Design an enzyme around this catalytic site. Structure first.
Site, PDB file in Angstrom:
ATOM      1  N   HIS A 146      -7.215   7.576  -1.947  1.00 18.87           N
ATOM      2  CA  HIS A 146      -6.680   7.643  -0.590  1.00 18.87           C
ATOM      3  C   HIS A 146      -6.094   9.009  -0.242  1.00 18.87           C
ATOM      4  CE1 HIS A 146      -2.483   7.375  -1.862  1.00 18.87           C
ATOM      5  NE2 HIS A 146      -2.612   6.151  -2.341  1.00 18.87           N
ATOM      6  N   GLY A 183       5.474  10.490  -1.945  1.00 19.49           N
ATOM      7  CA  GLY A 183       4.931  11.585  -2.737  1.00 19.49           C
ATOM      8  C   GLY A 183       4.652  11.266  -4.194  1.00 19.49           C
ATOM      9  N   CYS A 209       2.510   8.988  -5.456  1.00 22.74           N
ATOM     10  CA  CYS A 209       1.186   8.463  -5.774  1.00 22.74           C
ATOM     11  C   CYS A 209       0.487   9.356  -6.793  1.00 22.74           C
ATOM     12  CB  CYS A 209       0.339   8.339  -4.500  1.00 22.74           C
ATOM     13  SG  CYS A 209       1.034   7.150  -3.362  1.00 22.74           S
TER      14      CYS A 209
HETATM   15  O1  LIG Z   1       4.031   8.346  -1.489  1.00 21.89           O
HETATM   16  C1  LIG Z   1       3.924   7.216  -0.983  1.00 21.89           C
HETATM   17  C2  LIG Z   1       4.842   6.157  -1.537  1.00 21.89           C
HETATM   18  C3  LIG Z   1       4.598   5.456  -2.672  1.00 21.89           C
HETATM   19  C4  LIG Z   1       5.567   4.473  -3.117  1.00 21.89           C
HETATM   20  O2  LIG Z   1       5.434   3.784  -4.126  1.00 21.89           O
HETATM   21  N1  LIG Z   1       6.698   4.334  -2.297  1.00 21.89           N
HETATM   22  C5  LIG Z   1       6.956   5.032  -1.122  1.00 21.89           C
HETATM   23  O3  LIG Z   1       7.961   4.859  -0.433  1.00 21.89           O
HETATM   24  N2  LIG Z   1       5.979   5.952  -0.788  1.00 21.89           N
HETATM   25  N3  LIG Z   1       3.048   6.919  -0.007  1.00 21.89           N
HETATM   26  C6  LIG Z   1       2.113   7.902   0.565  1.00 21.89           C
HETATM   27  C7  LIG Z   1       1.028   7.269   1.405  1.00 21.89           C
HETATM   28  N4  LIG Z   1       0.531   6.035   0.796  1.00 21.89           N
HETATM   29  C8  LIG Z   1      -0.742   5.627   1.243  1.00 21.89           C
HETATM   30  C9  LIG Z   1      -1.588   6.476   1.982  1.00 21.89           C
HETATM   31  C10 LIG Z   1      -2.845   6.054   2.411  1.00 21.89           C
HETATM   32  C11 LIG Z   1      -3.298   4.774   2.114  1.00 21.89           C
HETATM   33 CL1  LIG Z   1      -4.908   4.312   2.688  1.00 21.89          CL
HETATM   34  C12 LIG Z   1      -2.480   3.896   1.378  1.00 21.89           C
HETATM   35  C13 LIG Z   1      -2.939   2.496   1.030  1.00 21.89           C
HETATM   36  F1  LIG Z   1      -2.016   1.793   0.341  1.00 21.89           F
HETATM   37  F2  LIG Z   1      -3.214   1.762   2.130  1.00 21.89           F
HETATM   38  F3  LIG Z   1      -4.049   2.497   0.249  1.00 21.89           F
HETATM   39  C14 LIG Z   1      -1.220   4.327   0.953  1.00 21.89           C
HETATM   40  C15 LIG Z   1       1.576   5.002   0.752  1.00 21.89           C
HETATM   41  C16 LIG Z   1       2.990   5.545   0.526  1.00 21.89           C
END
Ligand SMILES: O=C(c1cc(=O)[nH]c(=O)[nH]1)N1CCN(c2ccc(Cl)c(C(F)(F)F)c2)CC1
Ligand SMILES: O=C(c1cc(=O)[nH]c(=O)[nH]1)N1CCN(c2ccc(Cl)c(C(F)(F)F)c2)CC1
Lengths: 306, 306
Positions: free
Chosen positions: B41, B143, B145
């Protein structure tokens, strides 16, 4: 029209099946490019089945302990290694009939085709689902280990299952092609049992849509329900709960029949609470849960493969 | 003596962490030999999160859309591909600090260490368990991930988890390193929720053994029970059932304390039915289920790593 338990055409997989012998034990392997994949328990004897130490058993082997036969041709093993619960045997010749492929791990409720094999020779093809308890209700005799399960997406074979063992209840357990078991099973002879199974609700709904498409309508009614009222009843009959994502997935079938998902849930609720009363649906007197929404669309709209 | 939530030393993993940028999105990658692994992603924008088509999004990218930084050094991307839910970026330089490693998929109830990272920079290490509902109760901010989970077996790092997302309840979901999700989750923004969690019974028993080893004995009693009588009570408190294999696994702890497993089960039965009555066990007023039998032996007998 009509509706059958339909498997994928198996030609692309039949050409990858080989026989693997180590000692007095023979089973099936999967030959892709210059690697043959097979269950690691081929290196076990009778004394080892209870508490095998696979790293020890493997270091005590050499390449020439492994007899690999592709029909009549013999394949020379030039290397070997273990990846989790599968053995990878590097051979001197790359399979010229290697199709475009990938290794995928499937989820409970998804279906695939099984090519059952004995002595490297394909015997039959059938369709099954991965159950919520991570077993499959297969059909397998002595010698079938290393038989594989697969789907076909266009021109590409997605391998998802390799057969390792039968549990005491007569159901079957195995790994993905990276050697990781589905479910909490291990490849040794202990007293392991499958946990309780549940019925795959989104699949039952897809099958009721297939029935409507094929003219079976007697179970429909004018009522509607909510997700939470349905899920309340489903819990009591050991049905998997229904999510909003499931509702979305059934969209194409709702569209083609004009019957809303929650409308169909109310029919299912009635069927669970009153039974089928001696009537059948698509030739069955039980609610069938081994067809996905995608299986139904494929059979009730028509997609081929290359 | 003493008993702490102990993580594995993280040095071998810290040297594999890099920062991956594609467009305006930055997250963490894992750099092993000449491949960088990261959540797919990273190629999504705001408009794509709801219903991404990853094959489309990827064909529209070229190698130079991908900025990979290892501290100060820039890594040149010379190829890219998708494996399930992870992106594999081939780079021109093999990581000289690549440890001996393997990719393993763990089972519910097993523990691992998490190296939480931001912008390719390690921030902290902590221990957690894979829950029976295939989530982890992690600690992760925006951030994080691409942060990874791992165990160390002797000299070898076994990678088992890569972080992808946080669910609405504040728990965390991810994949193994072949890109296959743990649990029924997908990497898009839908309304997915974790199913109900249960307590990991074999882990609670291991922790009670650690308590006895460290001098907490007030909960023991003279009674004994059977597997089936215990499992009957465990069901009512949402505890996982106990198998014969679990009993075998607790053998070394039974041996070292002279308290039979079924003996300890009777103490657990009492604790579930009457509570702890304002007393603590190893500094906790709740029954702890995130230490495996192996964790306890490691900490209450002593194994190091290379
Ligand atoms: O960095 C974090 C994070 C992780 C965590 O654990 N806690 C928090 O607060 N933030 N992000 C960044 C962006 N992320 C994301 C981006 C695109 C897609 Cl398509 C998806 C999906 F899940 F839909 F696949 C997720 C989710 C949250
Ligand atoms: O060919 C079949 C078969 C499969 C089937 O599905 N049904 C059936 O009747 N027979 N075999 C061959 C031997 N197999 C085996 C050998 C060594 C080990 Cl160590 C294990 C392990 F499970 F403990 F890992 C299994 C089990 C049954």
């Amino acid at each position: 029209s009509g509706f059958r338990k339909m498997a994928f055409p198996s030609g692309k997989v039949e050409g990858c099946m080989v026989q693997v012998t180590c000692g007095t034990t023979t089973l099936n392997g999967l030959w892709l490019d210059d690697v043959v994949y097979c269950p690691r328990h081929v290196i076990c004897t009778s004394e080892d089945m209870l508490n095998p130490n696979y790293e020890d058993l493997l270091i005590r082997k050499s390449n020439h302990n492994f007899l690999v036969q592709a029909g009549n041709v013999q394949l020379r093993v030039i290397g070997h290694s273990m990846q989790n619960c599968v053995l990878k045997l590097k051979v001197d010749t790359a399979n010229p009939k290697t199709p475009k492929y990938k290794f995928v791990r499937i989820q409970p409720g998804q279906t695939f085709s099984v090519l059952a094999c004995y002595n490297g020779s394909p015997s039959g093809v059938y369709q099954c689902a991965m159950r919520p308890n991570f077993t499959i209700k297969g059909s397998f005799l002595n010698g079938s280990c290393g038989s594989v399960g697969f789907n076909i997406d266009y021109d590409c074979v997605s391998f998802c299952y390799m057969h390792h063992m039968e549990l005491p209840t007569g159901v079957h357990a195995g790994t993905d092609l990276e050697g990781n078991f589905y479910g909490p099973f291990v490849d040794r002879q202990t007293a392991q049992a499958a946990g309780t199974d549940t019925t795959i609700t989104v699949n039952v709904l897809a099958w009721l849509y297939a029935a409507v498409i094929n003219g079976d309508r007697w179970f429909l009614n004018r009522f509607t329900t909510t997700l939470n009222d349905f899920n309340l009843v489903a819990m009591k009959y050991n049905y998997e709960p229904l999510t909003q994502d499931h509702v979305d997935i059934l969209g194409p079938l709702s569209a083609q029949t004009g019957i809303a998902v929650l409308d169909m849930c109310a029919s299912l609720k009635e069927l669970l609470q009153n039974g089928m009363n001696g009537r059948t649906i698509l030739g069955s007197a039980l609610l069938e849960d081994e067809f996905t929404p995608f299986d139904v669309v494929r059979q009730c709209s028509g997609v081929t493969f290359q």
